[PDB]
Structure 1
Amino acid sequence: AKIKELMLQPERIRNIGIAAHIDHGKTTLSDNLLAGANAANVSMVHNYEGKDYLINLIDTPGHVDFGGDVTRAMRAIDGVIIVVDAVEGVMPQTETVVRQALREYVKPVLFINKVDRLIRELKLTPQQMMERFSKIIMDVNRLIQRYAPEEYKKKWMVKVEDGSVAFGSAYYNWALSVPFMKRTGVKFNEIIDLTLKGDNRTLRQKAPLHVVVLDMVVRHLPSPIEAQKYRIPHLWEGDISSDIGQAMLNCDPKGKMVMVVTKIIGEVATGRVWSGTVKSGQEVYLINTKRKARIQQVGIYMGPERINMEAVPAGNIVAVTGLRDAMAGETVAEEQIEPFEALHYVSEPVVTVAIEAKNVKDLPRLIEALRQLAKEDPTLHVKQHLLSGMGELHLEVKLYKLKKDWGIDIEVSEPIVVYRESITKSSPMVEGKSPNRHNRFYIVVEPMPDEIYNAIKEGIIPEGRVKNPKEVAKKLAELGMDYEIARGIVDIYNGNMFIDNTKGVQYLNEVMDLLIDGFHQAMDEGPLAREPVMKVIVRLLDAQVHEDNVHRGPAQIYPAIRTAIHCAMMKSNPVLYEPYQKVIINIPYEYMGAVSREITQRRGQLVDMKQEGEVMTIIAEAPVAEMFGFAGSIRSATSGRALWSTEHAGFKRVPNELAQQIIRQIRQRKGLDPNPPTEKDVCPLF
């Protein structure tokens, strides 16, 4: 409860993360650091030279092929503990995360781990071990000299002599730095002795891990109020001279409250309070998702657990509940400000994989273990059954958690790409008759103009049955559409729309709901390959509808409008669309040529290219179908130094020379007649 005494003082806060190479001592270090006094945040109170401090250990992923996570995490912290394995030394993955910390103006401190190996396995002398440390330190300081902001290329360098380097063993719970040696008296030659005779418990208290490392933390990693003076200008795109800008610049609880969301686990959003003061029952603007909401329960962290609190000021790490669907990275503020991150594309599942248990035993909580990942991850959809997500790696993570963590031996099919269908020309008028031949509909389908589709995808024109027809009609006419036709707008559905341009059709109003259901069925599965349809306009030109509902069931109306739509589409040059990924790659400049080649080899294109000193951020787009194995390729092409990630970037038309074989595969896979249908197969004779 001394936490509340501490949160009011920015200069007493340490917002930090741990960057460790896969198996260099990360979770071990985190765990034993807390015990020494996936989690979004874990906090620690630490006494240093009389005063107490509150240190926030924020989750900081280091999977270089999930760049998005690494980058976001770095943006949240002011200081990072680089952890390097004494034996193994500075690894390529370690260089990459360090690079990201430096890019996001995060000050580094070093912890050389697994020294216990140096002592027991190799029987090194103190002299030899200190020299080993010096090459590790030299390697790290080459990274800082190369990639740190120019202001800090020398300042941010780490040195054992001032205690911006410590060394020890996370596992065996001990660490040393020279400033700890001179306020305690201990030397390194005893720790060697204590290690070699096996006196683990005396080692543990004569040179304690948490004491030495957190000393380094407090002494050398900045507080929010210190760091936000140089970090906010690099993090935020708005007017710094403004007053929301100055409120974040200085670490300001005076001001209007502004926070960023770091992670989401009811739903719980962890976040960092840049300026102002968060409060329970606080109304806020969610800047990217462009909606509004109210903060229900606020809390602060005590180690792993969240303890309810409500008025907690700038500089702190917060948990809040009931923030709607705001995803990690969103800017939350009492005002409307320029967001820290830009709006991200919507995301839809585009790869699917077939999974089963190869031991027919573990199945029913394999089926729990399936919608269990769907529990925690909305972007994961499960139907065997089928796993559908955002890409190869997104799925693989799940497949990794099922075999190892949930202990299931599993068979896994080759991945399948999810395609879509559209058309490229307008159709002639087509008639659908119900089977009983008492209801008739006359339609055309037209290619939907890009400007209208985009307007639908980005919310300007809402999905669903159209509540305000004359308003939407006017918006459509603002876009390219003929206003009079536009007024017949009825439904918008998954990137398509249905339009009624009939006049004086008695009882049309009795069947309109069924026509829309049938419309939806027609878009659910297109005529080329039963893939979902996008970018089609259906227009109802005319119709004859029976007086009496006994002659108008679903069984009459559905097949009439469904077959009409599909036949018409077949007459309009039906085509396949395929999903693309936006590819965000971070590399040392020397690899620029190689990476470009790699993107071009997968039918991709460079979109953008940003440069900062010796580092390079490139943005590309490539077909999901061409991106399998990309981690492998970009790894060797960069000697493990690429940081990268992907986002959904919508759908584009499949090139004509690739399409027929892809259609054939999809139809074969679905147990259909392999031939791409033609209008002769879908439309009825004479």
Structure 2
Amino acid sequence: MEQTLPVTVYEMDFLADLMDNSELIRNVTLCGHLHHGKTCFVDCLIEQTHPEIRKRYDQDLCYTDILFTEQERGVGIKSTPVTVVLPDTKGKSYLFNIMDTPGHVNFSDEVTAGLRISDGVVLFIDAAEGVMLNTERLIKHAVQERLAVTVCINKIDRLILELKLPPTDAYYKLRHIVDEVNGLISMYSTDENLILSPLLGNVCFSSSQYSICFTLGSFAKIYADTFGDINYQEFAKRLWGDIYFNPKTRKFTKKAPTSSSQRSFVEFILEPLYKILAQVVGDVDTSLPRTLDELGIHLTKEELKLNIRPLLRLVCKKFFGEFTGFVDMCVQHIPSPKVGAKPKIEHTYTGGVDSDLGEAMSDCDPDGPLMCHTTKMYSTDDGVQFHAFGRVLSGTIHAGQPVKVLGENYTLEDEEDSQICTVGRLWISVARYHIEVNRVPAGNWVLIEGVDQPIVKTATITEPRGNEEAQIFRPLKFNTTSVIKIAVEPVNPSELPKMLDGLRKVNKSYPSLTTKVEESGEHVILGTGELYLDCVMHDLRKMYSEIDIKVADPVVTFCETVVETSSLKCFAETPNKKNKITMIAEPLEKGLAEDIENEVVQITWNRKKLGEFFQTKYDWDLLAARSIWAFGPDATGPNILVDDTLPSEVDKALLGSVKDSIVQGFQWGTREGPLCDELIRNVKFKILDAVVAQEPLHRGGGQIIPTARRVVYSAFLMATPRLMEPYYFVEVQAPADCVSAVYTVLARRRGHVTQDAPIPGSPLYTIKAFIPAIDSFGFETDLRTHTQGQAFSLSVFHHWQIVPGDPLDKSIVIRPLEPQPAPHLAREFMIKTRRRKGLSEDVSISKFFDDP
């Protein structure tokens, strides 16, 4: 290498040597809610590890947020990896691979691309705002991706300099935040060994505006370096949580002396922090130098001339020092990744831990078979070449070494999604500079050059000529659903290829982006919201294709459901006229689609446990519960294919002969659907009867897949079909007076307010509401404009709800450019999608039969 890297506290030979020892690596995702302090915390760690990289006085250096849209919007948009070497409280330097993820909920997918290559999570929580929408969603997604969860309660200065809470009441605020996170983790995990408390070191308190960062151990070590004889870990065991200090017996008691004494956190931690911040912001000129002398801090005369916020940042940089409590927390409570290799392989590898390669990936050894896994593609700012980013789980990538990239459709029997690509260069990716390395051992994160061509979203890089039984890591199961659908054409059609090129590039950049072409030749981008698609459209017009691009109106993708069983038992014969299939479609039981989608059931189970679930949970007979063939359009989709074919009428071996093709046709039918070619949802397809041809060249394949799709379509349409609306769950953070204004804004957009609850310890309220996602376009603009910016909303996908109309209603006339009323919205939503899709003007229930 030898590239020109900035001046740093460590040196890059020590970083490259900590890369080898994979016990001293912490793959950490800093995730939280929007603007909860993660990028400023990475800025604080960068300022700690880089003496020449300093934040400006009046404007925070972000140092991630390296995109232009990130610097202009102020919202983190892509996850930026930062590899630093951070020292611990004991002074021990650990290599830290930190993923600064976007906290905006629309970019939740980006967090998932960081959660896959991480062994741990630091959940950042505003101490003023508390637990918000994306903090709950990333608690859920962090304990569901089997990650160790720690908490940084950032912005504790807002308890001091904004709310001006008393130290006892701000302790109550922080304790309420820790209790809320504990309740959320106990909600989304049956285990209670991952209790988060600052006594355990799981909770860190911070203020990344002023570079405060302490756990209880690192604040106790300030006492241990100020006063010699105290052992700080035993002190940190007493600092938090209804433990009071008796200064006559000098001992920490659970019983409160004097009934007006404070807790150990208020006495020993919060009141010194309040006195530091109050002596800086209130009494700089009068009484800051004597308290600074009491804290051991001497500032230069040039430094005391600073304004109050840079002086606060400086005073707390000298008092708290390095961010060794963050390193305490992430070293004690985030795995090794040697220790964290086994849950990572058990969760994210498709072969599991029990494979011959899953064993060697659980060992995480650099002299093993190469098993890198990339989840992010990072474009260089010329836009042309991408760099695949991910972690090496075994082996060592080398620059110049040919390698076998496996895409997401690579199975061991379908070996065509692989490609042998020569690795161009390797970078250890810090945010604004890359350390070019010759090799990257296991456990480490790496930017790889040259493997970007055969992959779109997610790769498993292995080696060629060995690892023939190498499977892919699982694709990124995202936190939400890319629902908002925009059509995209070039202004000049002659530069369509540039746009297509750019469309491929935004498909690499945004992990839950879906770029497709519909049957009308309409190019379609799916996103999670309007900020997400605004940044996608910015990158499409400015970064990747330098051309002008018309956008359509944002629309949503709909689902399709049924509400009653099919009227007549529908059938379809093949073009052979052999192989009749006879299905009915009935709606699923309530909560079953949520069970199939959230992996409460799997078809990867055996028939016994699956049948036992469906018997004990949804009142299915074991006749029906042992007869489940597939699970909707994917292996976890909200539909079920059952065969109620009795073995008396049907030969069951002759039916298992074509079970694969009937399952394929059912999955394709639920993937498209006959109403508007958008996914079928919450429909049980019961194969009632199945004639099967006897010889295999008359059944199978080109006969029975489209026939099974036709009988899925006709069984769906004879059941009473409904469209489904995506509903956004909207968490509004408004003031107390703007709550009736939030209600007024939501009442114009079909939004039902679930709750308006006060943020405890803040003067704000959270209005949780359910807007339809077709009615959320400019909802946050409506809300922040109507409330003069005081209310702010984040809206994420929650569920699908049936549109109040009936989509197969030719009685409804729709004037083309009018907002339709509710009782025929589905009729507007079905045909316009059908026009967008370009299908026929209306779908008849008899289009897929054999009688017409």
TM-score bracket, shorter-length normalisation: 0.5 to 0.7
User: SS state of the match for residue 450, structure 1?
Assistant: coil
2:397 counterpart of 1:397? no
Label 1:443 to 1:612 Cα distance change in 2 as closer, same or farther (>3 A): same
Label 1:512 to 1:408 Cα distance change in 2 as closer, same or farther (>3 A): same
| Counterpart in the other structure of 1:633 | 782
Distance 2:664 2:483 in 1: 25
| Counterpart in the other structure of 1:382 | 515
Q: Give 1:414's match in structure 2, choosing from 548, 553, 558.
A: 553
Contact 1:349 1:388 survives alignment (8 Å)? yes
2:736 counterpart of 1:589? yes
| Counterpart in the other structure of 2:760 | 612
Q: Give 1:556's match in structure 2, choosing from 703, 708, 722.
A: 703
Deviations 1:23-75 (A, max 9, x none): 9744588899xxxxx644486999xxxxx9x9999959797997999996556
Deviations 1:488-539 (A, max 9, x none): 1111122111112221424223222221222123212222222211111112
Deviations 1:367-426 (A, max 9, x none): 333222222322111126321111222111111223344443221111221001111111
Shift of 1:590: 2.4
Map 1:8-87 → 2, pairs under 5 A: 16=41, 25-27=59-61, 39-41=80-82
Q: Give 2:587's match in structure 1, choosing from 414, 434, 447.
A: 447
Label 1:645 to 1:320 Cα distance change in 2 as closer, same or farther (>3 A): farther
Label 1:219 to 1:310 Cα distance change in 2 as closer, same or farther (>3 A): farther
Distance 2:778 2:557 in 1: 17
Contact 2:730 2:771 survives alignment (8 Å)? yes
Deviations 1:441-491 (A, max 9, x none): 22222111123222211112125xx66223312211122212112211111
Deviations 1:294-336 (A, max 9, x none): 576698969844699999xxxxxx97579xx99xxxxxxxxxx
Map 1:176-215 → 2, pairs under 5 A: 182=301, 215=314
Structure with higher helix content: 1
Distance 1:302 1:681 in 2: 56
Q: Give 2:839's match in structure 1, choosing from 672, 677, 686.
A: 672
Label 1:611 to 1:637 Cα distance change in 2 as closer, same or farther (>3 A): same
Distance 2:101 2:702 in 1: 56
Structure with higher strand content: 1
Label 1:590 to 1:69 Cα distance change in 2 as closer, same or farther (>3 A): farther
Contact 1:79 1:109 survives alignment (8 Å)? no
User: SS state of the match for residue 533, structure 1?
Assistant: coil
Q: Give 1:533's match in structure 2, choosing from 659, 680, 688.
A: 680
Distance 1:673 1:346 in 2: 34
Distance 2:748 2:532 in 1: 23
Distance 1:62 1:435 in 2: 53
2:656 counterpart of 1:509? yes
Shift of 1:562: 2.7
2:667 counterpart of 1:520? yes
Q: TM-score, normalised by structure 1?
A: 0.61
Deviations 1:588-628 (A, max 9, x none): 32222212332333222233435223122332222110100
| Counterpart in the other structure of 2:135 | none
Label 1:555 to 1:27 Cα distance change in 2 as closer, same or farther (>3 A): same
| Counterpart in the other structure of 1:283 | 341
Label 1:423 to 1:154 Cα distance change in 2 as closer, same or farther (>3 A): farther
Contact 2:784 2:790 survives alignment (8 Å)? yes
User: SS state of the match for residue 644, structure 1?
Assistant: strand
In structure 2, stretches of 5+ residues that fail to align are 1-7, 19-23, 25-38, 45-53, 67-77, 88-92, 112-121, 127-150, 163-172, 178-203, 212-269, 286-296, 354-360, 365-390, 394-427, 448-456, 459-476, 517-521, 806-822
The code of the aligned residue for 1:391 comes to G
User: SS state of the match for residue 570, structure 1?
Assistant: helix
Label 1:80 to 1:303 Cα distance change in 2 as closer, same or farther (>3 A): farther
Label 1:532 to 1:16 Cα distance change in 2 as closer, same or farther (>3 A): closer
Deviations 1:151-171 (A, max 9, x none): 9777645528649xxxxxxxx
Distance 2:606 2:612 in 1: 10
2:810 counterpart of 1:663? no
| Counterpart in the other structure of 2:10 | 3
Label 1:522 to 1:283 Cα distance change in 2 as closer, same or farther (>3 A): closer
Shift of 1:655: 1.1
2:610 counterpart of 1:491? no
2:628 counterpart of 1:570? no
Distance 2:529 2:274 in 1: 38
| Counterpart in the other structure of 2:569 | 429
Distance 1:63 1:684 in 2: 50
Map 1:103-502 → 2, pairs under 5 A: 106-107=206-207, 109=209, 156-157=277-278, 159=281, 162=284, 182=301, 215-216=314-315, 218-219=317-318, 224=323, 252=328, 259=330, 273=331, 275=333, 278-280=336-338, 282-283=340-341, 285=343, 304-305=433-434, 320=445, 346-359=479-492, 364-383=497-516, 385-406=523-544, 407-427=546-566, 428-462=568-602, 468-480=606-618, 481-493=620-632, 494-502=637-645
Distance 1:64 1:562 in 2: 36
Distance 1:447 1:434 in 2: 26
Equivalent residue pairs, number? 514
Deviations 1:642-679 (A, max 9, x none): 4432322121111121211211211222223333x343
Label 1:109 to 1:430 Cα distance change in 2 as closer, same or farther (>3 A): closer
Deviations 1:272-299 (A, max 9, x none): x564773556436479979988576698
Shift of 1:350: 0.9
Distance 1:545 1:551 in 2: 9
Distance 1:680 1:399 in 2: 41
The Cα RMSD (Å) is 5.3
Distance 1:429 1:62 in 2: 49
Contact 1:351 1:390 survives alignment (8 Å)? yes
Contact 1:425 1:573 survives alignment (8 Å)? yes
Distance 1:345 1:60 in 2: 14
| Counterpart in the other structure of 2:461 | none
Label 1:484 to 1:659 Cα distance change in 2 as closer, same or farther (>3 A): same
Moved more, 618-627 or 296-305: 296-305
The code of the aligned residue for 1:497 comes to I
The code of the aligned residue for 1:526 comes to G
User: SS state of the match for residue 783, structure 2?
Assistant: helix
The code of the aligned residue for 1:659 comes to A
The code of the aligned residue for 1:535 comes to N
Distance 1:539 1:67 in 2: 36
Label 1:509 to 1:449 Cα distance change in 2 as closer, same or farther (>3 A): same
Distance 1:357 1:496 in 2: 37
Label 1:2 to 1:57 Cα distance change in 2 as closer, same or farther (>3 A): same
In structure 1, stretches of 5+ residues that fail to align are 9-13, 33-37, 47-51, 83-89, 91-99, 112-148, 164-177, 189-206, 229-250, 253-257, 260-272, 312-317, 327-343
The code of the aligned residue for 1:548 comes to E
